[PDB]
């Protein structure tokens, strides 16, 4: 097993001299066009406001609120810090990508398709679950023609376990042949499920 | 972007009553790769396969947490103890797989759009608390700086069973609850 690197260590804030208080930091590797380009971001949050951020396309910290301004100015004063941070996009970000690619970028889990008459029967439900990645095409055909008019889809829903699901319902009083067609990257050919 | 790998960490505390919490996690697009148990210095992979593919030295997260803890106190001072309104969660309840009688399934309770990220789920079947096999996720962020959280209940669908998921958010006057029954 190879070891992932930290995407970042939070910078230290400068002190400028019931209750609840929150401090968050987020370090983001954005992988654009596959491996072509990386954009690296830092974000520093206090309660529900982003105070200051770093964008490698800019190369400097930028304050989003006045509370972040002393912090951006402080960190931007440290030339070696900015050099090291500027190195993360093509450094740790790409190191982590190389380890992760085979099971994240390239993760592939097949959808499971059930077609179900609902009520007599005034609706056909095409339930599609368990798939990864979240991009999917689910369409209804009646007698050969795709139906757009009377189709109601949920959003694609995150299950939180690295699978997704979607339900696509056709409002129809049973044409003669209904088919739910599912296209997904995990599959060599689409799944066509006809209703009994 | 096209894919995002995100290291997300936070440190937070309440006064009256006094309590503190912290979190460190790696995330890929909307999903979680791992978090670190910050009392135990343990890397906890979201799916077991991930720990057969990669490793992560957990104490790094704890060292980052100490930085975040110091930053919290500094920003509380710099802001003159600035605070913000709580937002209570909305809830969705749905099965992970197509429902079949007598076929093991998992019910998913998704709490969304809440702040701060302190919230517990409680599951009931036909009004009785159920705990065995429940899995609760850590808190996942959102671009609007609210949070979300998943809980999972393994179950076997039977006609007439009614499930409920209730979420207790820090500071809320009561739980928010939703119910679900297999069709």
Numbering used by the authors:
A (entry chain B): 6 to 22, 39 to 140, 146 to 200, 203 to 224
B (entry chain A): 4 to 186
Passage from the reporting paper:
The classical class I and class II molecules of the major histocompatibility complex (MHC) play crucial roles in resistance to infection and response to vaccines, binding peptides for presentation to thymus-derived (T) lymphocytes of the adaptive immune system as well as natural killer (NK) cells of the innate immune system. In contrast to humans and other typical mammals, the level of resistance to many infectious pathogens in chickens can be strongly determined by the MHC (that is, the BF-BL region of the B locus), at least in part because the chicken MHC is much simpler, with single dominantly expressed class I and class II loci. We expressed BL2*02 linked to several Marek’s disease virus (MDV) peptides and determined one X-ray crystal structure, showing how a single small amino acid in the binding site causes a crinkle in the peptide, leading to a core binding peptide of 10 amino acids, compared to the 9 amino acids in all other reported class II molecules.
Soluble BL2 molecules from the B2 haplotype were expressed in insect cells using Baculovirus, with the peptide attached via a linker to the BLB2 chain [it should be noted that, in contrast to previous reports, the N-terminal positions of the BLA and BLB chains are likely identical to those of HLA-DR]. Overall, the structure of BL2*02 is extremely similar to BL2*19 and to the iconic mammalian class II molecule HLA-DR1, with root mean square deviations for Cα atoms of 0.684 and 0.878 Å, respectively. In stark contrast to all reported mammalian class II structures and to BL2*19, the BL2*02 has a decamer core, with the structure showing side chains at peptide positions P1, P4, P5, P8, and P10 of the core binding into pockets, so that the peptides that were first analyzed with a nonamer motif were reanalyzed for this peptide motif; the decamer sequence predicted by Gibbs clustering corresponds to the core sequence found in the structure.
